[model samples]
Target: PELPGVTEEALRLKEAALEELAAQEVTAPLVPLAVSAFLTSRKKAAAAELADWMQSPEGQASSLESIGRSLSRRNHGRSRAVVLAHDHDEAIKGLRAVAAGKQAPNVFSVDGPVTTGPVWVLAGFGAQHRKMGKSLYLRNEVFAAWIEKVDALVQDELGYSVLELILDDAQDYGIETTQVTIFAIQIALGELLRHHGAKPAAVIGQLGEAASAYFAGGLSLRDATRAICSRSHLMGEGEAMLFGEYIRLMALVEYSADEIREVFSDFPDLEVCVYAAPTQTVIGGPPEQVDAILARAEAEGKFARKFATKGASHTSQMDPLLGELTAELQGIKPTSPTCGIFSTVHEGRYIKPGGEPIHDVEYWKKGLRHSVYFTHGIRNAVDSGHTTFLELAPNPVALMQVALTTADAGLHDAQLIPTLARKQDEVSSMVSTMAQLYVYGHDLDIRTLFSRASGPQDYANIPPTRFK
Candidate 1:
């Protein structure tokens, strides 16, 4: 029996998605996409029914794709929503909670760093969640496999595992860990989803565009990791010497780049004053110069918040580092991206297609010196038929910027979904986001998202994860 208002095209797409899933032996890793699709189309009662059927002897024998197509047919016309997480922890937690078929915070909390306990719980709940028509797609093989790669690179290059350095809270290790984990998770998820038939329409990365390039195949995993390490090292050093802070404005005020410069003209010492959002601007220079601008903004009665940063990035202050950073990328070749790359650098129009070169040393140098054109990137993503911008950072840095950008672009239909939030329940937030995306019709794989585990599995595949 079909749910009311389902369409044939939607049914067909779901069937196709399930067929892809049936081809895979380890369907647990691919459950989220199918179950999410099912839940998106049907109600809680349908999900409950699915929970029962998925575990029955007959259900166990049924192909994973068949179960997914059955659910996707319930409501085929939901609006597709786009998702972005506040950070890496949120990204992992969202999928974990959906897979556990439990409240988000129960499995993962937002108050601290993601730990081993929650990750193990996530793995154990993988199949149960899928039986309930929910999917969580983290796999030990996928997670450990990347760690091995990172471990190999670190041992061969630095003589120690980056993993150990991260756990030891070594300087810059936390940052490295965040970037590596986020990239690894995104890669695993994207590959699984694509393999099981939910090809991502578009992808975006924050802070640095390296991850975006990695997805596009312009850079290999090892090379991408190396670039991030190099960039972080250089940027951290620059910030160490520069005494500046980031300030967020109240709203999108009408002001030109020249107007902003005029306001900062009082301090000739200011080195970086770039437009982050229409309402947000980051100014870096001498402490007095930063103070002077902060006081002026406050006097004008604009709401302002200063961010504690390692240093001022994307300014002339980074100019000295361009040479070294460029040299660091020596001999690394970049190929064309598989999908469109709406870069936050160079005016955001550098769309590197698959088979084209993108990782030229000059590109890295210019990216470091230029202000992040993230807003422009978001605008371009929207224009290119990607209405969602998901931030994979640990905070809503990219999410907030995406919101401001879309709001400025007058795109109401553009959906911005954050993966994690500070002081909020993580799992609930994850489920809420799933519901939002399903309603918005951004085709997802619920089956893989909420699928149950199979046979004996290693819950503790990696060392316990800790955060500073």
Candidate 2:
């Protein structure tokens, strides 16, 4: 048997990967690490067979890490390719068609309040922790548990205080990853502030340095924790080391939040909107400020714990373990991210004396929290003159939130690029959407995309979705 979570298609590709590995092997080792690593539940032969059949140029590209490890004497890096081109041809085509009429008259023009040049990408925060491979906040459960946790673990004391005022037991409710992320934020913030000339010893040290790497390079605390555990024995268990690494990170988040308020505080005249996908409010402690959030859950008639842990996320509840973790983080230097040179922790312009700490904090904290939300950070683009919003990430969830936030903020000029959403999906959705966008943006209609998808149609039908 192969891995239980894998799809039939995934199994096939995994088989192909094994075949490629076998062809290049010096010896026919019974258990190839490449095959075993992926096969999980299945035996070696099953894994190898699975990887081979499902391989594609894109699949091979994504699986380069496995392939390289199979071929190389020492473990190397992943060679995942970045797929650009935000919206596909059909999407642009539809919009152009719609604009050819009048419904989408505001396409790409810079004529409104937020202007239309810059973009703000909103990455989701860390997900709560589930047991090894046990995720709760996948497709739909996001509204209750995970969203609520995001509400609780904020970078700023004001936001934290706001959460405290609004929700009881906010600190006690997040998943393990959320806790770690909060710590990462603290570490990132402290280091950033120190660079700005603020003394936050509580937030200083190695963890702060790691946090700096995350903010400066747009690297992740999750990745940082792994790096720490690999290099040092300080993390008690593999998991504990992860915790220690991230708790130090919280200093960074704290520092960044503080700086944001400091830098932008003077801009009382201009409205700066900050929005994230709050963890869902599923676990109950009291009837606090989340009555509406709870009510929405009830109306939907779902009564399950939220799946907030699918992605390791943000929050400050990890404060309890910050010190030991910070000490541990101080031990190593991080490899900087090649992309996001500006947003990386060390890359920011350090705040000097007389400058506002809040603004400095905002720049870094936003950089830290918003890296996953590159689409959100690109709000700068939309804020400039790019009236068209393109949700490049596989799912449109973040994009929908962006539209809602923009509209709620009364940003009349901006509009999302896709006229119709394809479907509501969970994980396995990267290339399909990309292909969809390609046909859509070229001024083609749904029929054209559907046609390509059908011939390439081993997958299911592309269902049209509505903007919520």
Candidate 3:
């Protein structure tokens, strides 16, 4: 990498520029080149052009797609895929990959494992969304009819209109319809893919461990629905008075349990702390105490953002739900999961596959009462020979976490793919991910991915329909 006729001063400047780039965590090679060009030739216009090219949205998207395409050519084999997501909506986003010709791999939910095809989605406390989630399981002939049946039951039992409520309208309480919004998109695109000759082997949902297991054929759908209903009711009753505040440190710093203990030792009001990733952690306690902790962290010049969920999950504060949750799950029989499933509640251990069957009320109770071991589960997936993970959520929460954790582990082979990008084109992101995976030796069902957008169009009427 010799630059012709560059002064020693310019070489020193280039060295300084590279170090600064490293400090700012810049990974794109163009940044280095831009710095070198600027330092060597003093071509401000050219450097500016390169910087703008790198920062352009379309440029970034194409760059990512090109990287994927290159990887696909080199890898030349089927790559194992896993779904690693934290929230329900994000999981639905992951499911969208199937609509785009990506393989439907085994999914690891924040709650449990998704092991079988067409995971049953049951809406809680509303009639408006049951049709959307349940439609994935029923045939086209009976899809509308099944929605009618569930709609009636939902109206009778939950006291919400099946038709009146807008699916996109925001709500604060009761069952979250955000899951329904994203799931409907997946089904719509899923059906489109199926029509175009691409059929996914399985599907993943945001359903909790017990519900996911039940949907996997370990329990009846009826029993699972009842269990979920009961679980939701009890959980509503067990709401902790303490508030939850999520924080992500900008710098990479690992805090030991003892170190965390010492930092909050003076603040006994802090109820629980969850290690979500190498840099992200969530702490729960009273609102004032939580504010105090946030103030302290920020005062030390740590970057932090508070989670909006407002629920103190994965903490002992949820202990009040145990007794009622146990009672609600009584008499419910569960068998071994018919497919491979793992446990985030148990720090990502396998619940099946020569492991003990998760069929008891205690397991369900623990799942609801314990802190989610998300990062642990991700590492476990890697240890178990998984190299690729598709996040099924609506956003990049779990995807980012897993990517960081894998990098921290020095697992150069691991690839974390996101299904959706916040405030960006969903379809483009999907295509980019597909392209990326294709380069890594993952065969993509291209027609299935583009069928909906370009399927019925007149190719002769369009300009340059094909690409090089």
Descending-lDDT candidate ranking: 1, 3, 2
What is the clash tally of candidate 1? 54
Candidate 2's residue-wise lDDT over 269-305, tens digit each? 2111222212111121112212332344356563323
Clashes of each: 54, 134, 15
Using all chains and alpha carbons, the TM-scores for the candidates as numbered come to 0.61, 0.31, 0.54
Candidates by TM-score, descending order: 1, 3, 2
Please name the candidate that would achieve the greatest TM-score relative to the true structure.
1
Best by lDDT: 1
Error of 3 at 177 (Å): 4.8
- Give the TM-score (vs. native) of candidate 3: 0.54
lDDT of 3 at 410: 70
TM-score of 2: 0.31
**Model 3 stretches with alpha carbons more than 4 Å out:** 1-228, 236-258, 308-311, 331-333, 352-355, 425-468
lDDT string for model 3 (173-242, tens) is 3433332233233333333333433332221222244344543456554455445555655544444332
| Tens-digit lDDT string for candidate 1 (286-325) | 5556666777778887655554554555656667788888
Cα RMSD (angstroms) for every candidate in the order listed: 15.8, 19.8, 18.7
Model 2 spans > 4 angstroms off = 1-13, 16-122, 125-316, 331-394, 413-468
